[PDB]
Scaffold this active site. Sequence first.
Site, PDB file in Angstrom:
ATOM      1  N   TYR A   1       0.881  -1.170  -0.064  1.00  0.00           N
ATOM      2  CA  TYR A   1       0.083   0.053   0.013  1.00  0.00           C
ATOM      3  C   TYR A   1       0.876   1.395   0.092  1.00  0.00           C
ATOM      4  CZ  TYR A   1      -4.254   2.690   0.703  1.00  0.00           C
ATOM      5  OH  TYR A   1      -5.371   3.647   0.486  1.00  0.00           O
TER       6      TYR A   1
ATOM      7  N   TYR B   1     -10.851  -2.856   6.756  1.00  0.00           N
ATOM      8  CA  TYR B   1     -10.253  -1.440   6.938  1.00  0.00           C
ATOM      9  C   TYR B   1     -10.441  -1.059   8.762  1.00  0.00           C
ATOM     10  CZ  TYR B   1     -11.470  -0.180   2.061  1.00  0.00           C
ATOM     11  OH  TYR B   1     -11.397  -0.042   0.890  1.00  0.00           O
TER      12      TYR B   1
END
Length: 282
Positions: free
Chosen positions: A162, A256
């Site tokens: 990421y 998340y």
Amino acid sequence: DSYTHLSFYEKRELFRKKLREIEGPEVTLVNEVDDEPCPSLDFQFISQYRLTQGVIPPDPNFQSGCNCSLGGCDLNNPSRCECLDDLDEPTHFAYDAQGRVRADTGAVIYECNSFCSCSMECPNRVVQRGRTLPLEIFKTKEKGWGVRSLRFAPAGTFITCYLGEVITSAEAAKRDKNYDDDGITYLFDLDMFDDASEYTVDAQNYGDVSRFFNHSCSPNIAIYSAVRNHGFRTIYDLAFFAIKDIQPLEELTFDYAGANRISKLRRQCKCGSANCRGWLFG
Ligand SMILES: C[S@+](CC[C@H](N)C(=O)[O-])C[C@H]1O[C@@H](n2cnc3c(N)ncnc32)[C@H](O)[C@@H]1O
Ligand SMILES: [Zn+2]
Ligand SMILES: [Zn+2]
Ligand SMILES: [Zn+2]
Ligand SMILES: [Zn+2]
């Protein structure tokens, strides 16, 4: 909004050109749900963190290396390798003979560095060798844009990192004031070893393929905190791995939650899980 002056075939064809310009396995774009040509064309695909003002980078002076068996560290000699100094016995490399993260590996992966005496083919340089699977950015039914692998991925396979703009806590404050009522955020706190330097990764403008990963309450990939600079850990790699066996054309999703207008966007969750929590944060 956007660049309403190029038409469908041009906008889309400019995105495909943008993907072909990415080094490594091929990344594709398909849409069979509606007519949207592509994600934003102001997005930039990067192969390494994008630092900003106020961020103290990782100081190479705190960085150490290992000796091991000039070529490739031996997976069966974890005590010799100085990179595994941390963590409690029985010391073992995070990866097995198959190059996938072991099932008994923790949340922290310790890899070799540029200081180490390895030829880049070291088994302990998985993340640093980048993406290996061919991915595809597709349009989902009830979500925006998604990602799915084209090849089967066993549990423990590395997907990608990421990436994005590394920003300070202050920088994130003034960006929040710009998110509209239905804005889409791409933040990821970088808080696992220290809380003083409250840095964050924002993928809105710069980022990697992973920016399009959708949330699921029953995910199939997880975040492993990979570390190279064993000294300063205010900045580290966010490396996605498979926590379940993933089949071709299966959507890649993570949770998340592995630990201002942002928390007032949220939206509703639609991962179709029988154990769905019902809510979501953008
Ligand atoms: C980091 S993601 C961006 C990926 C998004 N699909 C896109 O179009 O780029 C955050 C946004 O994706 C959407 N999203 C992701 N997972 C979702 C889910 N289970 N349910 C509903 N919306 C989701 C939401 O609009 C959310 O604000
Ligand atoms: Zn090594
Ligand atoms: Zn080593
Ligand atoms: Zn090493
Ligand atoms: Zn859900």
